[PDB]
Amino acid sequence: MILDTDYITEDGKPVIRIFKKENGEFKIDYDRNFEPYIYALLKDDSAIEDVKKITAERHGTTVRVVRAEKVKKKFLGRPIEVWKLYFTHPQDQPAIRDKIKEHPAVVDIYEYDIPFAKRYLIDKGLIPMEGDEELKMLAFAIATLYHEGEEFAEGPILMISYADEEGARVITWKNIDLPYVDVVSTEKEMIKRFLKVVKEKDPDVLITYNGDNFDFAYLKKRSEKLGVKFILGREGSEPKIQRMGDRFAVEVKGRIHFDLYPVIRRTIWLPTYTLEAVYEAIFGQPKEKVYAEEIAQAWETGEGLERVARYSMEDAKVTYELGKEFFPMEAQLSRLVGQSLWDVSRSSTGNLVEWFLLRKAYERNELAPNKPDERELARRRESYAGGYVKEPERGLWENIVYLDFRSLYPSIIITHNVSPDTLNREGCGEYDVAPQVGHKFCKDFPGFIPSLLGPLLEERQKVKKKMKATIDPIEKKLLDYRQRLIGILANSFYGYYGYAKARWYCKECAESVTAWGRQYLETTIREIEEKFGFKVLYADTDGFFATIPGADAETVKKKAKEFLDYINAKLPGLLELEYEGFYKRGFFATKKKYAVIDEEDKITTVGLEIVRVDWSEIAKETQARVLEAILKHGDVEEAVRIVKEVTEKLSKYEVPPEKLVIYEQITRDLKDYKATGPHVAVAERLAARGIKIRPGTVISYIVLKGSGRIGDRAIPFDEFDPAKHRYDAEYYIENQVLPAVERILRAFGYRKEDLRYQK
The missing domain is CATH 3.90.1600.10 (B family DNA polymerase, palm domain)
Incomplete structure (x- = not known):
């Protein structure tokens, strides 16, 4: 099984590397003889002799066409004859391709921007992730000491958690008598301990949840300060940190760094994309979050460290579970597209279609058209028609x-x-x-x-x-x-x-x-x-x-x-x-x-359900029961009654005050993303516990009768107690309950007016 390919440059010459797993053995083949190339369409063949003599000037070295051979190919339905221009190094192509395209007898150039190791996979007919080879996977997570105002990684890693077949463990440098925690002297030795269980487990897959942007970058900065060489590649290298858009991605040579975050974010649509959101909306069970500020509290303290170590190992065992769910999908996707699992799992759909197509165009001797220039790309801005x-x-x-x-x-x-x-x-x-x-x-x-x-x-x-x-x-x-x-x-x-x-x-x-x-x-x-x-x-x-x-x-x-x-x-x-x-x-x-x-009595809904930052269980319950009244009972009137009952019971205060918890997600740091609301109040109330509200950081709260505006007095259900606390029924009726059912009952002719009763 081929895991990945890249290339190294030795004395200016590209050497392709193939990372392979075969009969349980990791191998690396090298190919010193693969030649980068492009294609040129010439008005007249006699111009080739000019083009052979073209030369750039790259870092002082004269780069030229190493050779030219005329080839026949298909291009958009019609046969075409073009010149295949070879080069010494893939990165010789940019410097000399604009000069070649400048030649007045050159009509166009083709297949000039195709990454060299990806060119290799296609041209050699090689397919990543093929066969039955069992692959050893290992997930890991880190918890760090955080404090407002500090730079990224100013504080130490407190725990490195991992998880795989044998189970889940946590490595840390403070004593926690829990039996899955292993304790060592130092942050340094923790990191060395981590590097050592990797060497001895030697996984082919390293699973993280957003390791592309947090975990690996943290472990780099820390091991630098502590002067540890972060050696994770089976080839003796540190993790390699590419750009992809603004954000980054991380490779671990010889292994597959499977980051689940890009993968999840493009599969199931969650409202927010926390590890807890994922786990509860993939597996069913819930998962506890421990804010950063509490972790700092617990580490400066004696006790409370058992709960955090639970949260750390619970970062690791779910990532490994989630990785076991989403990996074979991506292995299958790599086989189909013909590219590495690493690239496959981090790429947009249209990009995977294009790598499939490039492989097919090569198999069929079909010349690839070029990606559009900026001006053509603005011409292709039509709005499309959409179906019936x-x-x-x-x-x-x-x-x-x-x-x-x-x-x-x-x-x-x-x-x-x-x-x-x-x-x-x-x-x-x-x-x-x-x-x-x-x-x-x-x-x-x-x-x-x-x-x-x-x-x-x-x-x-x-x-x-x-x-x-x-x-x-x-x-x-x-x-x-x-x-x-x-x-x-x-x-x-x-x-x-x-x-x-x-x-x-x-x-x-x-x-x-x-x-x-x-x-x-x-x-x-x-x-x-x-x-x-x-x-x-x-x-x-x-x-x-x-x-x-x-x-x-x-x-x-x-x-x-x-x-x-x-x-x-x-x-x-x-x-x-x-x-x-x-x-x-x-x-x-x-x-x-x-x-x-x-006929199984399973209700299916489209465009009606609750997609909301402000979702509460009285709402989800009430929408669910009016649907059940319309569809299971076939009784629309009852559905209306139910809303009247539920609005009455909200105002006569008869409703269990906890199904009125609004789990809200935060999109922007609390700069009044919403002008005001419950969120600015619960922020003040949990700053008392020392917590700041950041993007993510789910906020559960109940909305209380206060002064000022309805929905301006809100507290965590933590601080709620059914005495000296009344929920604001008007907020729950007009903001939670009725918006969840208005659309359904409008379809039956009822307005919001008809769904309450007071006087």
Whole structure:
């Protein structure tokens, strides 16, 4: 198994390094003979002799083209002949490429900005993360002594936690008789102890949660001050610290530094992105946070150090658990894209599509177009059209099918051979005309993108068959990740077409796919109404909800299935409609806002639920019960009653004052991000405990009847006690409860006025 590649420069010559794991052994192959290159398109071949003589002046050394060989390749549907220019060193390319492009006989240059070790992986047909090789992983976390005003890492690391197979431990330089803590003399010896358990565990994967930006940078500054050489690479080097945007990332040569933060932030959408937020919204259980200020308190103190050491080891065991969840996903993603897990897990989707495409263009001898210049990149600023959204039928309905298109946009790209290289080609014998926009896509030959996509969809189906046929659940889950990842890849080509930074950019292609999508949904909808008597309640882009008004459940199901057979014998090519699911009741408040229940009584919601910094359990409870009243009971009036009851019980003070805890997340440091509110009050009240409120730093609070404004008097539930404390019922009604249910009940004709009663 290939883990990674990079390159070193020795006497000015690049040497590729391959980091490998094979029969449980770590290996490093070196390749001294891989040659950087670019391609030049020349007006006349006789100009090559000028170009061979071009030379830059780089750090005093004359750099030139080492050789030139004429090659034949494909480029956007048409054959092309270009000159492959070799060089001694990859970094010779920038200095000499602008000079070559200056030559008046040079039309353009190509494939000039492709990182050398990534060029290696592609050109050599090598694929990271392939095979069955078991890989040893280890997570780690640190807790540090922090104090306001100090520079980064002015205070010592107090604990280094790690966690893996054997369990979770903490290393620290103060005595804690807890049995998972190991104690040593010094911060220095702690750090040496850490470096030593790594050497002897020798993991292939190092898992952190935001190690790219905190842990590794801290451990660097500290080991510098203490004069320890932070040796983590199996090759004798310190962690290497790249830039990526403003923020940074860290490599550990010979191992994979798997930072879960970039990975999580692009998978499940959490409100905030703390390690606690992640764990509770991935695994289910909760996790305690210990603020920085309390850790400083506990370390200067005797006791309280057992709780913090719990929080430290609990940083480490969850990171290893989370890493065990998200790693095989990224191993599968590395196989598919053909790039290292390190790069794969830190990269934007359009960027992973482009590395997949670059590998395919090489396999097919297809010359890559260039990324756009700044001015072209501003030209590609179109707003796109977006698929068909039907204004929904209002009110409550029963016996609903959701029908949808199997991979609608891939299906279309293949079916209509939609590709920059097939766009408005001349003398074409066979073309499909995109509706509305009128772009003509030649079908005399397979387009580059369609020809890649077809095998992807095929492979996906072959993987799903293997998934279901293999009894072993570890394998099933691997195959399931692979399957899903293929489908995300395939579903990303539509967006790639409009992606402004795309090498194979194609606005016409994007406009055409969207338009075909509209046509297929619209006519499919018209068909089921006019031929099968269905009523389409709502539709968004690749699917619709429908019922037969009056029919019973088995009738709509059975007729839904007949219509699939009908319409699928009519849909061209790969276009196919499938029966996704049946819903006993549902309602569609507006476009993108609806809720439905299936026969398992599982309610599914879209555009209605609580996404809020200010979420409270009286709100979440009350929204949940009105949905249950509309969808389980099919009783909208009761839903209204429930809101009236709950607003009454809030004002007559009969409501358990803790479900009125507002767990709020902080976005900006308390500079009045919100002009005022509960947050500025609870900040003052927990500055009493010594805590400052920083981004993250979840704040739980109850809002009390005070003077001044409603919602200006707030305290932590810590300091609450049901005597000399009354919650402000008006805040909980107008700010928590009614906003959670207004939208649902507006869909049934009720205004906020109707949802209370006082006088």
